[model samples]
Target: MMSLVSDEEWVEYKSKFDKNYEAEEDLMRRRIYAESKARIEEHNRKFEKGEVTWKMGINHLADLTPEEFAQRSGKKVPPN
Candidate 1:
């Protein structure tokens, strides 16, 4: 799906967020960013189908993994 990240998309996103990670961390965050994008894509589809009250889009925190997001938001991630 289009949500799957490409090199160019990764570069663009990093630019948009003013992100500069260590080379290795960049590699890791890219995967997390892609996962976030995939979720956005699905939720936006729900919006198109009128199943959601709001549309989804990327933001400054888009690259954070779920665990990181939970930590920053002061919420606990559910165990899986």
Candidate 2:
């Protein structure tokens, strides 16, 4: 698939996070990333508008879906 957001942002996010996947896996992760980015930006805008209580942005693991995030284990904690 192409990208739901800017191609540069897609590449940059992957580069910044050292993210890599092949075939449909990449597509799925990219989709998750797109939605996360959109949601984060919208939430931040709401906070600025006094609509939301807090703000957030992309994390190193932001591309993962909530299901996968919930499946995570180990000592490290990260957002979905």
Candidate 3:
């Protein structure tokens, strides 16, 4: 499809668009990191409380959905 904007204009627009996209991606990475840290802390607390065993690795947490992880960990599955 032919762009309505001129080629130069399209280039500038895409450059601006990519910059914002990269910034948003960086923000999401940081948000994921913080949330992962918090979940690890909570998991450790539950392990200490004897609520669940710490048999799974962090990869299991990353690989599974919340419900799946809870089920695998012998915790009550969270309501969807």
When summed lDDT is taken over every stretch of 10 residues in candidate 3, the lowest stretch is 1-10
Q: What digit string (tens of lDDT, one per residue) describes model 2 on residues 3-29? A: 564334546666666774333444445
List where candidate 3 sits over 4 angstroms from the true fold.
1-24, 55-80
For candidate 3, give the lDDT of residue 46: 76
Better of 1 and 2 by lDDT: 1
lDDT of 1: 0.57
TM-score of each: 0.50, 0.45, 0.34
Candidate 1: misplaced stretches above 4 Å? 1-3, 66-80
Compared with the true structure, all predictions reach lDDT values of 0.57, 0.56, 0.37
- Of 2 and 3, the candidate ahead on TM-score is 2
Task: Report the lDDT tens digits of candidate 3 across residue range 1-80.
Answer: 12221223323433544522222332323333233444556667776888776632222222223433344455765779
Cα RMSDs, all models: 6.8, 7.9, 18.0
List, residue by residue over 1-80, the lDDT tens digit for candidate 1.
32355334556667666874433444445556666676677678887887767767764445556533544455754777
